[PDB]
Write a protein that binds this ligand. Structure first.
Ligand SMILES: Nc1ccn([C@H]2C[C@H](O)[C@@H](COP(=O)(O)NP(=O)(O)OP(=O)(O)O)O2)c(=O)n1
Ligand SMILES: [Mg+2]
Ligand SMILES: [Mg+2]
Length: 347
DNA sequence: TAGGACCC
DNA sequence: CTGGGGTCCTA
């Protein structure tokens, strides 16, 4: 027997949800983000269709930047309520195949299938793709392996509308010549540090001395970076419901603020909007954090713990404004944010 | 508590 | 020019 980890990720998620109700746009570049107005600044692309992506438009790109690259593109406002309902339709369907399923964000899910050696995991992936296609109209891609991070990397090669199997038989074959940030968990900043140390590929990272990576990244991050290069990762798929450790709300304003009454007002409204939402889900606040971005993108965040776990609205607003006054507040502010950290439950 | 570094 | 919402680790 072999314990396979299957990673399901939805193709161009937000675009496909819109394309499902707009057959007029089937072949045209569709861009989701910020009220559907490409003139608006400080708004970014949250999804670009595969057609729009061939123009170089990707997630996080400003709307006006995307308008420059693809003028022919239909811009749609983001509709989170529609994406949530499409997400639960997909996921409430992925649990009813009788497998351990670890939901991971709206777009992705890890599925555990302990199959006999004579049985092919591709047959499970082939089923997943078309029960999702036949009952939601959305297309997915499945990555197959024996750990989450490698199944995740396998999904990248399966896109679009495909399946890709990645194992130790072909791991270093496929990934050896790739840069470090091709692994899940390592990004641009670590890849830059490794390049300055002579490590430029996954293969070179996999045979790097541990007491060279640990004394450069941390005692456990160093060894974890070494596992990842070897194709290892997390192997337990847990169907337990995830409990959020915190919830937050941030806003970038159209023009940078200057008056503090507006800053005291934004922090208070953000704090009360977040508090009302955690009360609804039955949570209790432990600490209050406030974030300031400034025009030069200098963002730091301060946090204060409450005397006791509370959800009192007067106390949390007072605490948020008290953390805000702890801030220097010289330059114009670009973004203010409130994050309420939640007591790690009970029932 | 602060802050860097991922990721969707 | 550089959104919004999360989490884990390290100093
Ligand atoms: N930086 C990002 C990345 C994704 N998202 C949202 C929008 C995505 O449609 C959705 C799915 O995340 P994603 O799989 O990484 N990208 P997306 O599914 O849109 O395109 P592909 O998976 O086909 O490459 O999360 C976001 O809001 N900001
Ligand atoms: Mg996706
Ligand atoms: Mg995804």
């Amino acid at each position: 027997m072999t314990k396979w980890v299957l990673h399901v990720d939805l193709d161009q998620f937000y675009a496909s949800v819109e394309l499902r109700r707009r057959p007029d746009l089937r072949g045209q570049p569709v861009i989701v983000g910020g009220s559907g107005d490409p003139s608006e600044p400080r708004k970014v692309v949250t999804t670009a269709s595969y057609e729009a992506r061939e123009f170089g438009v990707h997630a996080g790109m400003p709307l006006r930047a995307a308008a420059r690259r693809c003028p022919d593109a239909t811009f749609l406002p983001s509709d989170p309520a529609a994406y949530d309902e499409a997400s639960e339709q997909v996921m409430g369907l992925l649990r009813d195949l009788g497998h351990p399923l670890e939901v991971w964000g709206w777009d992705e899910a890890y599925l555990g299938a302990d199959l006999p050696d004579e049985s092919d995991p591709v047959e499970v992936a082939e089923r997943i793709r078309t029960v999702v296609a036949a009952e939601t109209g959305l297309s997915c891609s499945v990555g197959i392996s024996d750990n989450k991070q490698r199944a995740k990397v396998a999904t990248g090669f399966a896109k679009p509308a495909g399946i890709y199997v990645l194992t130790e038989a072909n791991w270093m074959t496929v990934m050896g010549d790739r840069p470090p940030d091709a692994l899940w968990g390592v990004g641009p900043k670590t890849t830059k540090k490794l390049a300055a140390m002579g490590i430029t590929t996954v293969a070179d990272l996999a045979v790097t001395d541990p007491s060279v990576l640990t004394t450069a990244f941390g005692p456990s991050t160093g060894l974890w970076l070494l596992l990842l290069a070897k194709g290892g990762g997390d192997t337990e798929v847990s169907s337990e419901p995830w409990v959020p450790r915190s919830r937050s709300h941030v806003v970038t304003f159209p023009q940078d603020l200057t008056e503090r009454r507006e800053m005291d007002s934004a922090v208070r409204d953000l704090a009360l909007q977040t508090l009302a939402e955690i009360v609804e889900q039955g949570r209790i606040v432990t600490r209050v954090a406030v974030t300031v971005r400034t025009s030069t993108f200098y963002t730091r965040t301060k946090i204060r713990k409450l005397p006791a776990p509370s959800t009192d609205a007067g106390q949390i607003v007072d605490t948020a404004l008290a953390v805000l006054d702890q801030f220097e507040l010289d330059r114009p502010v670009r973004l203010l944010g409130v994050r309420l950290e939640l007591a790690m439950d009970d029932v």
